[PDB]
């Protein structure tokens, strides 16, 4: 349980790409989570965890360099 290992650097870029491109509505559908899971090589449960962590930590970081990261 919780054998934490950081995802691929490219996988993080993919997740970040979808997040900042859909910053108006950062809630991917079930089918959207599956596509992200395949590109990142992770599971859909790990996709939901990442978005769950990103949304609160983005809101937490509001607002310093997150405005810059909205260029994805």
């Amino acid at each position: 349980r919780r054998k934490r290992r950081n995802f691929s650097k490219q996988a993080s870029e993919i997740l970040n790409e979808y997040f900042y491109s859909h910053l108006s509505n950062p809630y991917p559908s079930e089918e959207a989570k599956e596509e992200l899971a395949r590109k990142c090589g992770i599971t859909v449960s790990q996709v939901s965890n990442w978005f769950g962590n990103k949304r609160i930590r983005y809101k937490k970081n509001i607002g310093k360099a997150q405005e810059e990261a909205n260029l994805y």
Binding site: L23, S24, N25, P26, Y27, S45, R55, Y58, K59, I62, G63
Partner: protein, 63 residues
């Protein structure tokens, strides 16, 4: 800022978790009476005990 951007959790003690887990082994679903009994014994509200068993069952399915 975005529209989607627009309390308070406290981790239970070891005693509370063990008793809640012990009862969960007997039955994954708990009646209104036993829920009140656990709430009184484990210093929680009836809703908290209710919510705990709901989360516990979901955890049990994910495993």
């Amino acid at each position: 800022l975005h529209e989607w951007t627009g309390k308070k959790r406290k981790p239970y003690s070891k005693f509370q978790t063990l008793e809640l887990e012990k009862e969960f082994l007997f039955n994954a679903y708990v009646s209104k009476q036993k829920r009140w009994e656990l709430a009184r014994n484990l210093q929680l509200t009836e809703r908290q005990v209710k919510i705990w068993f709901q989360n516990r069952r979901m955890k049990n399915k994910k495993n």
